[PDB]
Amino acid sequence: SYGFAVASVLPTRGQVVGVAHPVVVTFSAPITNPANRHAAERAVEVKSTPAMTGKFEWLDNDVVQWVPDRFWPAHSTVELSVGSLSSDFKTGPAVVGVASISQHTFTVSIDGVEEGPPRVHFGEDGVMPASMGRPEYPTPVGSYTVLSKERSVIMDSSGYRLSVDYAVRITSRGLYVHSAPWALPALGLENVSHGCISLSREDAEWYYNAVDIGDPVIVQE
Ligand SMILES: [Ca+2]
Secondary structure, X not given: OOOXXXXXXXXXXXXXXXXXXXXXXEEXXXXXXXXXXXXXXXXXXXXXXXOOOEEEEEEEOOEEEEEEOOOOOOOOEEEEEEOOEEEEEEEOOOEEEEEEOOOOEEEEEEOOEEOOOOOOXXXXXXXXXXXXXXXXXXXXXXXXXXXXXEEEEEEEOOOOEXXXXXXXXXXXXXXXXXXXXXXXXXXXXXXXXXXXEEEOHHHHHHHHHHOOOOOEEEEEO
């Protein structure tokens, strides 16, 4: 009996990840029976050092992720067991971005210290003017993690088609923190994007270069 055989786990052994990186478990074969998912979850029980609580979310019939309830400690070696499989990974700095819909800001902290690169400009370090989604295409509130980072990626409406310089992806569907030079007059003032968190090129560059996959991004009203 091997229906719950695990092919692979992320983070990989020794990987350097951001402080909210999920534990992603990929099964050798699809678990198509939703009733068998609880048994699979138990087969892949996640035990970390330091201990951490978390919740499973099925991404596909052969992929379950365990989302930690809290941030991993920064600059650390985290020991990880998934079922009997013993591994470890490392965390870099805690690079946390908080988007405020009402304030029109994106606030970046590194290990707790608000910081930004050395038009509206706030003069509180780490507080970047931003522009979130318009009423018809709002930025949804919640807790996200950086899924990928790319340069000069094409984003289209699927009306628009944009070549976007610094793109930090936070949902599978296509929500990003990114550089939005065409949108400068709105930053710190109005929410005129299509759901993405728009920054100036310079702010986006600094944030992109600072953040890692797995770091948290919080959207709040
Ligand atoms: Ca990384």
